[PDB]
């Protein structure tokens, strides 16, 4: 268990080159004697993989980084390879997947695992009686509170250590993605000496685990042999590398096993492949695309400030404002962060209109003002563009177009008392349809009948203003909401609210993401001459995107500039003929390449 | 580039537009096929010869001068003073096609519409005919026609 | 009539930005506006109005 | 602690279990993550226990001032607002018509017609066409085939 | 084109008599808590939502 | 509003504030009495003992 092994030798991490490895197919759909472009997690062609050995003075079973995806490609005699275990940390701190061989079963457990720092599996003591089976279960110390379990049926593997070339090639596609954890199994009988075989493969997808879990790391179980830290190794191999949001084509045959694939990625070659949607390209120049600048880091710069916003004197607040007279309060030079107001916990509805809740950290807002009054239980719903109620219809309106988020939850708990609380009233009676945002405190007797009330209350004459029954007793239907309207104007002015988003270091004449009081975007940042005026933030061209920001903690301004500029050319003779091609770039010196 | 133009740098969009998938290469398909009979256009009419036929030095036409249409080798580029003329009285994008990306970066013109045409995926393919070669096809069209009379486009120049 | 041939290519290249500040029904033209704003299925309704056009 | 995909494919169903989760003063046997370092992916359940960190001062896995233990109870009664009240909750969450299907609706299966044009009902995938044998074999995990066209050009009985 | 009516309506489905645990999961006793919850696999079963 | 008793309003074909300025060929009130939880069935496209049958 907790025992680590002696004779391991260190040795550089050598890498490794797969050819076509990493082709799975990205779905259940039958395909024949088609050409199909996909686009989903794959191991790049030609990427560069890790050496990885189990043998008489190597050992190797590192922690690897999962990053969104790993192939998993293992030439294999003696089964050196028992599985895997997945997780984040690799301790009992978190919840790890582990996927083993015990020989008997596949063992597919997602629990809480005591970690050892070198897991494996060992085969004891043969000489006379042959044996070779199993000991020692070395993987893990302790499981706890596990959530998956599977366990397949009972098989006897061949355990026996074999000599000479690896009988075996077995391939995996490792990705979780949505709490789903795909695996993409191949096994080809193979002939090789050492390296990976040169070759295609189309692996395909073996079991599905519902695991949810994180998984940025991984390790290899291997199998110990002598004739507890003095085993060896048997001979074996396992190559990993990393998927990538490629693009593949892909080709069916006529039976619809893939025959072969082209990465998109690759060289200018390939992607004219892709856009000629074959892999035979004729003699001839072919226009791909511009030469794209990935952004080295994202950039985010907000304006900094270390004051959390009102959230306990506009949400907390004793007494909110009547509906027909609603409190405005405006909201400026403060962090906006909602994860206070889950300390305690109230709202019944939150909907955003002009954005979407999980960017309201990511992006920040202008001119934010609260909206705040309380109403009976069933009228929140008359909160909403277009709506139409003694609310919305006549006291309280929102615009059309309205872009901010309505914030509501029972305050029967608080503002129902005894008999009834007539402190909250509303606008039963309003001679027209105020616009939006008006705010109407006027008590003048409404005039229902044609006779003049004359400020007096009568028959066809009614005081505008009446109030809401409120008890504990009440239906909730009937219970007050208190109700904050939060309105604002967004990426179109100077933000003074910023999320709890920690801003990053500037980078400059680099391409990079940024992120600019919430805009978010791929450019270069420059120095410029433009000067914004004090109430100008973003500046914009003709193709109406962002031209230059400002730079909301030091006062400047940077122009935006596009990555992925120029064109390329693919100078080619046809496939048929050789694969070497030149690339001619449009736009540029030679620099780039 | 129509994965350029209609998404700009955005990988989010960039798969929504794989959706429409062959959309954006069935537009290139024609816009290269107007690229590459625009070069059909220019081979069909300035190069009507194999040879390229060039004025004996010594001149005489019978009083004819012709030095107004022939090439003159003082100009960097060979070229007759009309055709001179005609290069200056049409105005076209900046000489040469190569932009650099640091000439756009580096000083960005106000309201330019090269660069802005560029970072949009809009780009200008060079023609496969110099206006240098030009004038040396008409230089050689002329020549014939001077030297040869009309034989040498039904054969040799006679 | 051959400067109307450089206009008109010019122009037409010219407008083809023009083309881009168009909002195409969508809540704005820009589209690092509506990926800071909209969530993906939110924004996917908004861009495909933006690739649309 | 619960989130769901943006591409989320399925049904979610909610309903009020005050009548039963709500015992006495409380039932604290129904926890919630109030605090959580990141947000986790969809689908992605956090056992983790571990004390939340909202300070600068490392919590060394104790309670303490700006150190919360992660896992807070709701409060249940019967006499708490509907607001408060529990609701369980089932999401119900599938891949369709993409893949093979084992659960199927009270659907009567009807006699499978060759030959003749029909209206075709397969794993819930319903269209016009004409069925033929083939010599296509699917994969074990293979239900639907598709053209050029992307519509479904064979499908597994 | 000419254009060929179906003529008949054919349903073909995966043949099962096991309707689907809607007891075992919506009538089950007590739900997990929210931070880690039950994810059980409904899989060969017919899906009927008139029992509930 | 006097007796203002609605919990959900929702005009489908319509939009609400037009209902003073646009009015109706036909107008038929249908009226009964459900469940709380089953309102949400009332709707097109719903399901349950209510929608479903
Ligand atoms: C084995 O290697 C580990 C490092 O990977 C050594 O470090 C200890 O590991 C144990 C868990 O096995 C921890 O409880 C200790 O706190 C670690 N100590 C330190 C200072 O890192 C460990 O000493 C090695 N020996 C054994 C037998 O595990
Ligand atoms: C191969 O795997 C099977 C399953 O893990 C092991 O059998 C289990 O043994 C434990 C011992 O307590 C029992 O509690 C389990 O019930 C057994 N399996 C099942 C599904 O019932 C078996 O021991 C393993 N063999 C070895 C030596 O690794
Ligand atoms: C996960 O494991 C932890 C600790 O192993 C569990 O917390 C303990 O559960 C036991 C049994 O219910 C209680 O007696 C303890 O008081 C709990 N606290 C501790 C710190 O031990 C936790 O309930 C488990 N949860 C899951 C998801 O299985
Ligand atoms: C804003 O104020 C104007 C002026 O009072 C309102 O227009 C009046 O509307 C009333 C009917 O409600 C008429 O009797 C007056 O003759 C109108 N005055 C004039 C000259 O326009 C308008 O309706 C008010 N708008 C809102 C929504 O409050
Ligand atoms: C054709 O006309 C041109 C232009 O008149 C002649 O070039 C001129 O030659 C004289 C000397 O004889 C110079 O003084 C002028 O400055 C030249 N003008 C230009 C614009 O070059 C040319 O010599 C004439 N050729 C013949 C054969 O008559
Ligand atoms: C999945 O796990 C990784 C690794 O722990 C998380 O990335 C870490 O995030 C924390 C902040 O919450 C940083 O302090 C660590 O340095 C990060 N580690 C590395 C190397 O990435 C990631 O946030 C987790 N994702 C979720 C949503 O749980
Ligand atoms: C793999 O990457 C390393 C740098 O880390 C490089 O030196 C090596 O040549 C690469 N191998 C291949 C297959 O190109
Ligand atoms: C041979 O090995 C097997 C498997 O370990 C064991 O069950 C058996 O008792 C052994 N027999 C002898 C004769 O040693
Ligand atoms: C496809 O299937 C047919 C029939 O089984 C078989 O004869 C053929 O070899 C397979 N491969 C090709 C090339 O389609
Ligand atoms: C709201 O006020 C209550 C009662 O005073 C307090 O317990 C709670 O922490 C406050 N919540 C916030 C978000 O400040
Ligand atoms: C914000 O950061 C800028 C540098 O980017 C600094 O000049 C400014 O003083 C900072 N403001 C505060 C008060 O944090
Ligand atoms: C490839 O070239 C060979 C030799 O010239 C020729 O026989 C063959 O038809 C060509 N095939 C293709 C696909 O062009
Ligand atoms: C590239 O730059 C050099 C000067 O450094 C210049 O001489 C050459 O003409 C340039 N080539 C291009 C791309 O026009
Ligand atoms: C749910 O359980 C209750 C109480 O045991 C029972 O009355 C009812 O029939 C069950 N409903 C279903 C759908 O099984």
Known sequence: ?593 | DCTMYICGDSTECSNLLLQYGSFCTQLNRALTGIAVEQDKNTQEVFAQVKQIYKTPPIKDFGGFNFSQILPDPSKPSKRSFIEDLLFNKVTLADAGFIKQYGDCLGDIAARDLICAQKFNGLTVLPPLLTDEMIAQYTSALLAGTITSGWTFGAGAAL | KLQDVVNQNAQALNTLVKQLSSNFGAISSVLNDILSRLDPPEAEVQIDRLITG
Not at chain 1, 192 to 201: A, E, H, N, T
Not at chain 1, 322 to 347: E, P
């Open chain 1, 1 to 593: 268990q907790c025992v680590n092994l002696t004779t391991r030798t260190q040795l550089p991490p050598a890498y490794t080159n797969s050819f076509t490895r990493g082709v799975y197919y990205p779905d259940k759909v039958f395909r024949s004697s088609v050409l199909h472009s996909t686009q989903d997690l794959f191991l790049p062609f030609f990427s560069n993989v890790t050496w990885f050995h189990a043998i008489h003075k190597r050992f190797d079973n590192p922690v690897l980084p999962f990053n969104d995806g790993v192939y998993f490609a293992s030439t294999e005699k003696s089964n050196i390879i028992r599985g895997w275990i997945f997780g984040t940390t690799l301790d009992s701190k978190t919840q790890s997947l582990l996927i083993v061989n015990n020989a008997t079963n596949v063992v597919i457990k997602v629990c809480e695992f005591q970690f050892c720092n070198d897991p494996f599996l060992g085969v004891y003591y043969h000489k006379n009686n042959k044996s070779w089976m199993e000991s020692e279960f070395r993987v893990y110390s302790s499981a706890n509170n596990c959530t998956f379990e599977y366990v397949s049926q009972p098989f006897l593997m061949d355990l026996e250590g074999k000599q000479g070339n690896f009988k075996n090639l077995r391939e995996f596609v490792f990705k979780n993605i949505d709490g789903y954890f795909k695996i993409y199994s191949k096994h080809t009988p193979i002939n090789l000496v050492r390296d990976l075989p040169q070759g295609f493969s189309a692996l395909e997808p073996l079991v599905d685990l519902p695991i949810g879990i994180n998984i940025t790391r991984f390790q290899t179980l291997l199998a110990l042999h002598r004739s507890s830290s003095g085993w060896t190794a048997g001979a074996a191999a396992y190559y990993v590398g990393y998927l990538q949001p490629r693009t593949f084509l892909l080709k069916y045959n006529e039976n619809g096993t893939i025959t072969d694939a082209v990465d998109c990625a690759l060289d200018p070659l390939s992607e004219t492949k892709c856009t000629l949607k074959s892999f035979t390209v004729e003699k001839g120049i072919y226009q791909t695309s511009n030469f794209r600048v990935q952004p080295t880091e994202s950039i985010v710069r907000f304006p900094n400030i270390t004051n959390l916003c009102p959230f306990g004197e506009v949400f907390n607040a004793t007494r909110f404002a009547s509906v027909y007279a609603w409190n405005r309060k405006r909201i400026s030079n403060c962090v906006a962060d909602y994860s206070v107001l889950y300390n305690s916990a109230s709202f019944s509805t939150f909907k955003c209109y002009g954005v979407s809740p999980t960017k309201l950290n990511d992006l920040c807002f202008t001119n934010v003002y609260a909206d705040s009054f309380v109403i009976r239980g069933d009228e929140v719903r008359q909160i909403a563009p277009g709506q139409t109620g003694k609310i919305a219809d006549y006291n309280y309106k929102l615009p059309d177009d309205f872009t901010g988020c309505v914030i509501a939850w029972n305050s029967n708990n608080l503002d129902s008392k005894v008999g009834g609380n007539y402190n909250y009233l509303y606008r039963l009676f309003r001679k027209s349809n105020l616009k939006p945002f008006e705010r109407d405190i006027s008590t003048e007797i409404y005039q229902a009948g044609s006779t003049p009330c004359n400020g007096v209350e009568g028959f066809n004459c009614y005081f505008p203003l009446q109030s809401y029954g409120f008890q504990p007793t009440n239906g909730v239907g009937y219970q007050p909401y208190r109700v904050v309207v939060l309105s604002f104007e967004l990426l179109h002015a100077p933000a003074t609210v910023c999320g709890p988003k920690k801003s990053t270091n500037l980078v400059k004449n680099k391409c990079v993401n940024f992120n600019f009081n919430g805009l978010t975007g791929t450019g270069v940042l420059t120095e410029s001459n433009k000067k914004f005026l004090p109430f100008q933030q973003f500046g914009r061209d003709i193709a109406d995107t962002t031209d230059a920001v400002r730079d909301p903690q030091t006062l400047e301004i940077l122009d935006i500039t596009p990555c992925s500029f120029g064109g390329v050319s693919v100078i080619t003779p046809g496939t048929n003929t050789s694969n070497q091609v030149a690339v001619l770039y449009q736009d540029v010196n030679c620099t780039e390449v």
